[PDB]
Amino acid sequence: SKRALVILAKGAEEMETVIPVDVMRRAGIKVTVAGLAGKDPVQCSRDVVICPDASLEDAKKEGPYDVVVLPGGNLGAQNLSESAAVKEILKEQENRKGLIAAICAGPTALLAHEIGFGSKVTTHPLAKDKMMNGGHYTYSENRVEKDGLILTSRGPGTSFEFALAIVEALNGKEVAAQVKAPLVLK
C-alpha cells in the first residue's frame, strides 16, 4: 500500500541505497529503485553494481509516491544535484506535501534544488559546510533528523535508523518496531 521512490545514481553509497530499500520492503512498502541515467546497471561508490527496477523516466510516470528517498555518496549526490528530472520530482513532492528523505551527502541535493529551506537538517559531518552554504537550513547533529516532511540522516552507520524512521513516518511506530526486531540491532 505505501509507495517509495529511491533514486539511484552512479556513485551512490550502496549501503545507503540497499539498507533503506530492504527495510522499506520488510515494512510492506512498495519500493521502486529507479536509475537516474536509465534502466542500465548502476556502479555504486564501492563498485557494487545494482540493477534498477526501472529508469527514473519511467518511474516518474508511476507516481505519486509517499516518500522520495535520496541515498548519499558524494558522487551520487552530485549526480542527483545536477538532474533536472530530480529537481522536478522533488518540487512536485514538496508541492503535494509528501515526505522527502535523504542521507549522508544526499541532503545536498535538496540544497541544489531549493527544497525544504528553513528546515532543520543533518548530513554526514563532511557534507555540513556544503549543506550550510547560505544558511538555508538549521544544522543538527542528531543521527536522524525529521522536520515535518524533510527527513535527513548522517552516514552508512545511521542507515538503519534512517530507514526505520521512514517506516515509522509512513506505516507507524508499531510496524517500525515489528520490522526492527528480527534485524538484531543494538
Collect all residues with Cβ–Cβ distance below 8 Å to 111 and sequence separation of at least 6.
Answer: 81, 130, 131, 133, 134, 136, 137
Integer-rounded Cα radius of gyration of the chain: 15
- Which of 44, 51, 113, 124 is flagged as catalytic? 124
**How many angstroms separate the CA atoms of 179 and 22, rounded?**
11
Q: How was this structure determined?
A: X-ray
Q: What is the dihedral of CA 99, 159, 30, 169, to 10 degrees?
A: -40
Strand partners, 147: 150
Asked if 24 contacts 51 with a C-beta cutoff of 8 angstroms, the reply is no
Q: What is the dihedral of CA 125, 5, 93, 69, to 10 degrees?
A: -10
Going by C-alpha positions, the residue among 121, 128, 171 that lies closest to residue 150 is 121
Residue 113 among the catalytic residues: no
Residue 51 among the catalytic residues: no
- Which of 44, 104, 113, 136 is flagged as catalytic? 104
Asked if 45 contacts 60 with a C-beta cutoff of 8 angstroms, the reply is no
- Exposed/middle/buried for residue 21 (C-beta within 10 Å: 0-12, 13-18, 19+): buried
- Domain ranges within the chain, ordered by starting residue: 1-186
Asked if 73 contacts 13 with a C-beta cutoff of 8 angstroms, the reply is yes
**How many angstroms separate the CA atoms of 140 and 143, rounded?**
8
**How many angstroms separate the CA atoms of 149 and 23, rounded?**
20
Q: What are phi and psi of 150, to 5 degrees?
A: -115, 115
Tell me which H or E stretch contains 120. strand 120-121
Going by C-alpha positions, the residue among 153, 152, 182, 177 that lies closest to residue 167 is 177
User: In the structure grid, which three cell numbers stand for residue 123, read together?
Assistant: 548530513
Domain with residues 1-186, CATH architecture: 3-Layer(aba) Sandwich (3.40)
Asked if 162 contacts 112 with a C-beta cutoff of 8 angstroms, the reply is no
**How many angstroms separate the CA atoms of 171 and 25, rounded?**
12
Tell me which H or E stretch contains 58. helix 56-59
> Around Cβ 82, how many Cβ atoms within 10 Å?
13
Asked if 2 contacts 29 with a C-beta cutoff of 8 angstroms, the reply is yes
The single-letter code of the amino acid at 25 is R
Collect all residues with Cβ–Cβ distance below 8 Å to 181 and sequence separation of at least 6.
Answer: none
Report strand pairing: 99-103 vs 3-8: unpaired
The single-letter code of the amino acid at 100 is I
Asked if 54 contacts 25 with a C-beta cutoff of 8 angstroms, the reply is no
